[PDB]
Amino acid sequence: GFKELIKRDLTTEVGNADLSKLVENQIVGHCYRGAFAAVEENVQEIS
Amino acid sequence: GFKELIKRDLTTEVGNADLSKLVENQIVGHCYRGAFAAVEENVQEIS
């Protein structure tokens, strides 16, 4: 009942830079994911 | 008594990541540099 949906696991692309400030490219991470949980599978306990 | 410090002689870069539509890719150059002068070495002549 648990499914892991992935389109892009992870992508660290160098971002746009303001050359007029001599600021380096914005390192930015990006992931397109999702999950599908359920209740039929799981049972809670105490201690 | 004269030491020139060359960290980065010259580097020119060009980019149009987020510039205006009417502005072509602007060009920027920069250099890391430093110089140490002194009075231990100089004598000032006239004529």
């Binding site: - | 205006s20 539509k21 009417l22 502005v23």
Partner: protein
């Protein structure tokens, strides 16, 4: 479809019968104050700059010191910048004060 159509750095206008603009000069046309990128004639289309950028100009009234930080107001009658703060329109703030050559660096403002 997208509401945003352009970055808004430049805006087009149509010259009236009492207006004429030359390249790279400041002109208040139809409520937009900016730097014209084309030499325009009556009833012609030109493009201004509203880039919120630092701008250089010497087209100032040379009577009062433009010390850094003071607001810059554009006087449409005399076609000059000034620090009068009268009914003239507000257009920017001085970044670098006036030099001996009467040159000003100032930041444009969002036309409110």
């Amino acid at each position: 479809t997208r509401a945003k159509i352009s970055d808004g750095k430049s805006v087009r206008v149509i010259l009236s019968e009492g207006e004429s603009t030359k390249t790279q000069q400041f002109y208040l046309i139809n409520g937009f104050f900016g730097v014209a990128m084309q030499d325009g004639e009556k009833g012609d289309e030109v493009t201004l700059q509203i880039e919120q950028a630092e701008y250089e100009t010497d087209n100032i009234v040379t009577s009062e010191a433009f010390e850094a930080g003071k607001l810059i107001y554009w006087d449409n009658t005399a076609k000059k910048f000034t620090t009068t703060s009268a009914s003239n329109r507000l257009v920017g703030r001085v970044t670098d004060g006036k030099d001996s050559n009467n040159v000003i660096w100032f930041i444009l403002l969002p036309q409110q």
